[PDB]
Amino acid sequence: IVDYRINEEEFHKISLLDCDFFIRKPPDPDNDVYDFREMYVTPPDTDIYAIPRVLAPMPQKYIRCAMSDYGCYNVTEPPIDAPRDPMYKSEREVSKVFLTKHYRNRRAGDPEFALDFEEIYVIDSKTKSITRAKVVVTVPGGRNRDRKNDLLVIRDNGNSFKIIPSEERDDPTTVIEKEEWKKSRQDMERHLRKLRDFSVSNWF
């Protein structure tokens, strides 16, 4: 606990499921400049500030980043105790926030604008920690690869980051069918294992 109440007007307020993250914002025309020198984490809608867990080397200079949100929608069924009581309740339930630095700190309105997928900072509400993501560049070109053709694939609950070309992508139907087929194969093998003839058998 810092024990002093900061002025949240000069900070970036990022809301999470169980936490609120504050990052100092330098004066800028477009609110996309972040200062990672001063940062605080608070309980949900609480004015008791604290120091977050810095688990990775944080940038010590002003950088222009793009915020994103990661989570799952919780569509519940609230009890109906009134005539016009709502039939459903939908919540975004953000879990991880991704900060993607702009290439060369360029503005969004510039003629050449690209996102630097090599410097990703994630924020976790469960662990109350901010760390730097580990990406696996696989696009040919090394460090001279053009940033106008890049695709960042995020899987495994925000733990796997890969940079692949834009043309080499899979449609949503493909990945959905892949995961469904994998789960179905695993469950079918689990079900058929208990049969006394599973040993002398063949999956066709």
Partner: protein
């Protein structure tokens, strides 16, 4: 009627039943309106259990599990595609929900449309 409703809302073959080989080595129909999908089903273009994509107008009323996106595609220009289990939510750099597409069958949309149209016809006939 219970049997009919169960056949409507049962679902589709999802895993090994729908495909013989893993799609790793390698759904299709896209309908803007529910009326188009129902007309295609009446014209026998798509089967009852055949999967399809239906565009929704920013409602997010589909009940589903609390599961993170299985895969997220983020391009340089700022638009990131979030692929979920049963729906696709395209967004832009401004954190604006551009498009939402639900992955379902003609049975669920038929049940939803018939209930909604019953309510709306009651409300209209009242006046």
């Amino acid at each position: 009627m219970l049997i009919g409703l169960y056949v409507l809302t049962s679902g589709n073959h999802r895993g090994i039943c729908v495909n013989r080989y893993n799609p790793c080595n390698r759904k299709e129909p896209f309908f803007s309106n529910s009326y188009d999908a129902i007309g295609a089903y009446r014209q026998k273009r798509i089967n009852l259990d055949s999967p399809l994509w239906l565009r929704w107008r920013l409602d997010q009323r589909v009940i589903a599990s609390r599961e993170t996106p299985i895969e997220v595609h983020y391009e340089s220009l700022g638009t990131f595609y979030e692929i979920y289990g049963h729906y696709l939510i395209v967004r832009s750099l401004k954190k604006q929900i551009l498009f939402i597409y639900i992955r379902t069958t003609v049975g669920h949309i038929a049940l939803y449309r018939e209930i909604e149209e019953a309510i709306q016809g009651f409300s209209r006939a009242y006046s």
